[PDB]
Amino acid sequence: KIELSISLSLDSPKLDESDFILLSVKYLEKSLGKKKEFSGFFEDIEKLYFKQNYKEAIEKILDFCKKNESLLSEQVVQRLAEVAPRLKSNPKDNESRRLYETLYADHLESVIKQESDLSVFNELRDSYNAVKPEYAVTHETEIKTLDEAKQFILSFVMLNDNVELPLKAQSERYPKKDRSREELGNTPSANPGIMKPNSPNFTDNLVPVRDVPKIAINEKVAGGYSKTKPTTPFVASLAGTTYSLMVVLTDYIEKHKTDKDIEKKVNQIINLWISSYIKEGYHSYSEVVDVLTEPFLQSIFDKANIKLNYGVLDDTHAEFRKAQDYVFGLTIQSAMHHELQERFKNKEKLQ
Amino acid sequence: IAALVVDNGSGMCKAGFAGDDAPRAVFPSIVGRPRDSYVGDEAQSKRGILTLKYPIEHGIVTNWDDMEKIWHHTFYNELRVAPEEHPVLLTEAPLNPKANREKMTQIMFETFNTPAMYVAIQAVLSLYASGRTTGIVMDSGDGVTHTVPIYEGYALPHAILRLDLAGRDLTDYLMKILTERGYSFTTTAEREIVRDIKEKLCYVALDFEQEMATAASSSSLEKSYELPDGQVITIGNERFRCPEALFQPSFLGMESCGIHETTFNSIMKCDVDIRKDLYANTVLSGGTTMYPGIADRMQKEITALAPSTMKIKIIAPPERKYSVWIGGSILASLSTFQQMWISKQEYDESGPSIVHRKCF
Ligand SMILES: Nc1ncnc2c1ncn2[C@@H]1O[C@H](COP(=O)(O)OP(=O)(O)OP(=O)(O)O)[C@@H](O)[C@H]1O
């Protein structure tokens, strides 16, 4: 009984916009079978979900439910349209978006793997050496596998607070960084990517236990990025280390502005940086991209005629379905917990 | 119509129907072959002329032909039902290998043709049986003493601790210390007699040193037992010295921490914000917890280890010996849980890996 399952899922009190979209798409794709007439809305909603565009996807879901209702369940549609106005997003607990972004980062790594050659990172080694300060290291080893390139780009963390200060000072939108300073320490976790430790997870989606940082949100700062963009999972904050990558990449682009395939190379670099800051829980997708899309930082890519893909993929279906299953499980579990609690309160009242 | 519940164990399998209050078939998890094949109690009668293998070792299934045989016995010989007509819920050890989950799901759907099924963590069921969703379950049984903290129905795998210290080791320890008193207990039947002595007379002393002093300075604790052959044995301090091998595993030549320190450690591997709700929600389970005084001993030990300003509540149900199975029937009888089963359709779609996405 899919309608009963979805109506039970929709009763959750912690439901958010991400869970709304995932559950609504699951319901509509289960009711409406695989039809060519309809497989232009599901992918549209997947793309609108990938870009944190939740108001538009919610409106499209509601309109698609108004039409086609002869093939749907009237009470489920009414429940959907009743839940929709009251939904919000909590940056602390977008636990469906966290799973989605983790699986997306894994897929982005897997698709950058299908690249011909890693020559871009070997060429970027020289640009890193030219800009690496005295209080840093020097890269001399040839890069042959993705892991070497990942460690190489992650090593740009040494450039922070030394060379990227002039780049941060001029470009706005960073004064709105909402990363709590209070060092809360570390905590064990077996949850990959930007997932939280205590949250559930599939048993085939587990990584070896390790200490992960405990970062809170600075609510005191007015107009923080977590308030103006509630829909993004708060992992650390707006990605302040992406300025180091930007400095290195400005050097690389200035040295390679005349390259035939500079666009593909810079896309490879940016995509690996994005899929590596999520696969290791430093930052979430939009925490990096909202830095990468700053106009003062878009000027560098505009002068060289660089079209940033921003990691956008042509098939994000698999992690969408996995997030659908995740939200289904979570909401049905919450419903069962409520039924359990009431079933025991009844016994307590009776005796 | 009724959904079967099958809690599996290294020693004893507990099988029955959802909605009940106790299993209808609790039988040994053994398979015997001549020294055909027999399972459980029927292999119990011929223990002398059969090779009794335990397909679950330390909570984790190791033999799968033997587990298929036990499940066939449970279905066609103990509950007298057909699995094709009922949704068969099952139980798994914490931190179960994922290949084992896939194998049990494949067995359920391909050799017994169950219309639906599900796999739940035994400690989570034990926490449900007390009407709880957050708390730490100290599931001490026959093969393994697991310590599982649970947050809103999820068993946190980054804090689940295992302990190879359970009832079988205690029975062997009691055999050893009975031999250290002149009573020859070495063979198998001697193991059954000593296990019966341990169930009937042993208890957890609140103060081991003071209890030893009292047992040496008097004979009030000195109790009596009768062998099948008619001989009468007498057990003194050895009553409270056997279960102590759970709070001081060094008695068995093990460098472990003991169930109290294992529990405190497993709590300490958790977030600081859920530690208050893990202390005050400590649930005990399993047979090796059916010791008089074990709950107050756990209370005192945890109060020693835990901070001195946070409340601690050890929860020992009188039915704790079955808290798993009870929690498996409080679950497989809920109306919401009727949507959580893995349908045969879902299996035929997603392969044996559907268990990872449905039963998380
Ligand atoms: N009253 C009792 N007091 C102490 N111990 C007992 C009592 N009754 C049974 N036991 C012990 O408990 C063991 C079986 O307990 P239980 O069924 O909880 O474990 P299990 O689930 O079969 O094993 P596992 O935990 O490895 O799956 C037996 O070996 C027995 O020695």
Ligand SMILES: C/C1=C/C(=O)O[C@@H]2C[C@@H](CC[C@H](C)/C=C/CC1)O[C@@](O)([C@@H]1CSC(=O)N1)C2
């Ligand atoms: C009464 C009972 C319970 C039990 O815990 O028994 C199970 C099963 C038993 C093996 C079967 C045996 C031939 C007879 C069955 C006894 C079943 O091994 C155990 O007794 C082991 C051996 S000593 C011990 O403490 N556990 C556990």
Ligand SMILES: *P(=O)(O)OC[C@H]1O[C@@H](n2cnc3c(N)ncnc32)[C@H](O)[C@@H]1O
């Ligand atoms: P954002 O760039 O603000 O980073 C926030 C914290 O994540 C850690 N971090 C960032 N980048 C790295 C690398 N490459 N390696 C290890 N740790 C990293 C920093 O501690 C930041 O404080």
Ligand SMILES: [Ca+2]
């Ligand atoms: Ca058990």
